[PDB]
């Protein structure tokens, strides 16, 4: 279920205590707060305090991100807004200074390594002619499409006493005019009339000889990566010197802005400060303790809440019992129910682990899964976060206890189905005659020989479809019920209409996959399709005429407990049997190779397949059941208690 909620709302005859009320009302956290009538309380001095605290918050998480950190909570910073700003300001200034250095080292290196190739090309195209006392050199870049325009411009402007050396490279030409010292101005005018100019080398290096300029780009491009390594080391050291201070200071600032933002949601007047908020009924004892100290001024009571009106407004939080709580991980990310709708969480522990056991159905695989449960239990026991950066996976040790609880339910059903099928690494105990059947009888009779397809397929196909019938009909019964619980007849008719149509479709199929009879099937079929055509004309939901084929396919969709189980079973068997080929053909080396090759192939196909075996069970809940009672049709308001960011440590 979702937890039952009620409205709290303290009032009184004096204004000034309301900040002390908010303080105790965040030390115990139980209340989600709306605006009590509308938001109309603030002061310009309270705005100035809120600006300074939200500046400390933003400046702390900004400088944490410059340091490459994340804004997790810590022990709160001990005292004073003035000390908060005086602690933050020198740290933020150092972090921004090291990032400003890093950005300019990046920009210098980037520009140097671009110009370095054409400068080396032109410095190799030259022979030290730049350093000549008697003549002069003009560097530029061009393309072979237009080099004749430059030769013509020089021919017209100067009396063929120039030179023009060149070399091609990817996408262009390195070009080098040479002239007598008087004529460089004429060469610059000639190039300008060809749409060309001297190549401006990036820095003040434009004043240096070309062969003297190229050396500086080369040494700076070689040296700057070492200076990047130095500023990265200094910025990492600054993080070690200041992370714990920033973490504490960001934690403080979060709580201060939470109180000062929440202060706007009070109603206000001639005496009162009236607050409002939804509270869980199991949480009331803490609200009582938070307000009992303030009975010198407050008056309060808890009002019952209507499920009909405000249903989009009341918050939703879940309250399952301890055997069902871990299975919230499989459902709470999909949607948040509306208040007074159904919570499907307790249906997850009863069907998901049972279908996983039916699919896998191997005692040898169940023991490999049990050894993963023992491994995860070590992180819970030591209180270590699991980290696997390949997946960006981090699990806090409290979440690993949720996974281990679910995995123990999956192991249990996999061993009991593994004795029903007589399966332990496929065929291994059945080669040994520990498990057997009348073809080669053994110590333990196999209850359902899963791979004896001509004997067992009809049993396992009907048994798979029977779960499909049961949950599809239960989800449609929930839709009819939740329609009546709100007098919403458009949901009632859709629920009972699809139910009657599915009874009609099944009674038709049963009467054709066999023999017809009057009383048990041919009557009930016409009642089924009669209730369907009625519910369409009553509701005027014309999407029922298309979607009845969708609903009938969701029953047949459950034959994936047999199909993926039997695909897993035969493949595991033949890998074992390939082991016994090596063991029977050869001597003691064959018993070693047979064990080794079978083990390597089993581990590989247990890696490739198992996430598929976990996924096929859960999605039968997620679409073939949850879409029946309308789980996705509306979103409830998430429960968001007024709390400290410190998470109660």
């Amino acid at each position: 279920p979702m937890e039952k909620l009620v409205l709290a709302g303290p009032k009184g005859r004096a204004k000034e205590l309301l900040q002390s009320l908010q303080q105790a009302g965040v030390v115990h956290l139980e209340t989600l707060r709306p605006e009590a009538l509308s938001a109309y309380q603030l002061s310009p001095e309270e705005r100035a305090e809120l600006r300074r605290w939200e500046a400390v918050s933003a400046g702390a998480e900004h400088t944490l991100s410059l340091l490459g950190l994340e804004a997790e909570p810590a022990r709160p910073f001990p005292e004073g807004l003035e000390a908060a700003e005086k602690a933050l300001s020198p740290i933020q200034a150092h972090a921004e200074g090291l990032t400003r250095q890093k950005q300019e080292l990046e920009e210098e290196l980037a520009l140097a390594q671009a110009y370095l190739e054409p400068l080396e090309r032109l410095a190799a195209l030259a022979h030290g002619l730049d350093k000549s006392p008697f003549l002069r050199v003009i560097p530029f870049l061009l393309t072979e499409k237009e080099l004749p325009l430059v030769e013509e411009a020089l021919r017209k402007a100067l009396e063929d006493r120039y030179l023009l050396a060149h070399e091609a490279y990817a996408g262009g030409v390195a070009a080098l005019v040479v002239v007598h010292r008087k004529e460089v101005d004429q060469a610059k005018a000639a190039l300008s009339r060809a749409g060309v100019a001297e190549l401006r080398l990036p820095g003040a290096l434009g004043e240096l000889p070309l062969s003297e300029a190229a050396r500086r780009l080369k040494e700076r491009a070689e040296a700057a990566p070492r200076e990047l390594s130095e500023v990265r080391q200094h910025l990492a050291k600054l993080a070690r010197e200041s992370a714990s201070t920033l973490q504490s200071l960001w934690t403080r600032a979060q709580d201060e802005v939470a109180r000062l933002k929440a202060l706007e949601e009070l109603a206000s007047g001639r005496f009162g400060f009236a607050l409002l908020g939804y509270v869980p009924v199991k949480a009331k004892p803490k609200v009582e303790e938070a307000l009992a100290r303030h009975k010198e001024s407050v008056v309060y009571a808890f009002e019952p809440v209507d499920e009909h009106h405000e249903a989009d407004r009341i918050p939703v939080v879940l309250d399952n019992p301890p055997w069902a709580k871990p299975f919230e991980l499989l459902v709470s990310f999909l949607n948040t129910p509306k208040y007074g709708t159904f919570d499907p969480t307790p249906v997850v522990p009863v069907f998901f682990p049972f279908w996983f056991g039916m699919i896998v159905g191997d005692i040898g695989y169940a023991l490999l899964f049990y050894l993963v449960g023992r491994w995860l239990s070590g992180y819970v026991k030591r209180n270590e976060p699991l980290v696997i950066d390949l997946f960006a996976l981090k699990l806090k040790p409290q979440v690993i206890g949720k996974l281990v609880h679910i995995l123990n339910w999956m192991v249990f059903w996999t061993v009991v189905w593994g004795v029903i099928y007589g399966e332990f690494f496929g065929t291994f105990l059945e080669h040994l005659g520990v498990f057997g059947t009348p073809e080669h009888p053994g110590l333990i009779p196999i209850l359902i020989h899963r791979i004896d397809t001509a004997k067992t397929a009809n049993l396992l196909i009907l048994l798979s479809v029977a779960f499909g019938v049961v949950l599809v009909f239960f989800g449609l019964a929930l839709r009819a019920y939740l329609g009546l619980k709100h007098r919403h007849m458009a949901h009632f008719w859709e629920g009972v209409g699809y139910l009657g149509g599915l009874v009609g479709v099944l009674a038709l199929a049963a009467s054709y996959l066999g023999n017809l009879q009057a009383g048990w099937l041919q009557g009930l079929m016409y009642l089924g399709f009669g209730v369907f055509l009625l519910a369409v004309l009553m509701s005027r939901i014309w999407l029922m005429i298309p979607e009845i084929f969708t609903q009938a396919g969701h029953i047949l969709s459950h034959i994936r407990i047999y199909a993926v189980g039997a695909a897993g079973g035969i493949l595991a068997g033949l890998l074992t049997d390939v082991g016994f080929a090596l063991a029977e053909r050869l001597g003691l080396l064959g018993v070693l190779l047979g064990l080794l090759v079978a083990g390597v192939l089993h581990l590989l196909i247990l890696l490739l397949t198992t996430l598929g075996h976990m996924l096929q069970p859960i999605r039968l809940l997620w679409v073939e059941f949850f879409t029946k009672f309308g789980f996705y049709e509306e979103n409830g308001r998430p429960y968001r208690p007024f709390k400290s960011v410190r998470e109660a440590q």
């Binding site: 949607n335 969708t550 047949l556 969709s557 999605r619 996705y632």
Partner: protein
């Protein structure tokens, strides 16, 4: 004689095979759009499952015709 038992089996291969091939042609493009919607906003997930697993009634109806044929064999 067994000429029909054989040809009924090649009719079953067509029934499940071409139906399995047409739902993959749908989910390729509906799934490649679906992961992009969830990448912009995680709250899209339920709608992107519903649309991706909707084209999967085409493989349940081809597999049904293969099972009607498996009753005549």
């Amino acid at each position: 004689g067994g000429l029909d038992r054989g040809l009924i089996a090649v009719g079953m291969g067509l029934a499940v095979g071409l139906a399995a091939l047409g739902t993959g042609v749908a989910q390729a493009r509906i799934g490649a759009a679906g992961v992009g919607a969830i990448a912009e906003d995680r709250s899209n997930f339920g709608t992107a499952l519903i649309f991706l697993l909707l084209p999967e009634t085409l493989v349940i109806f081809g597999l049904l015709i293969a099972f009607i044929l498996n009753g005549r064999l």
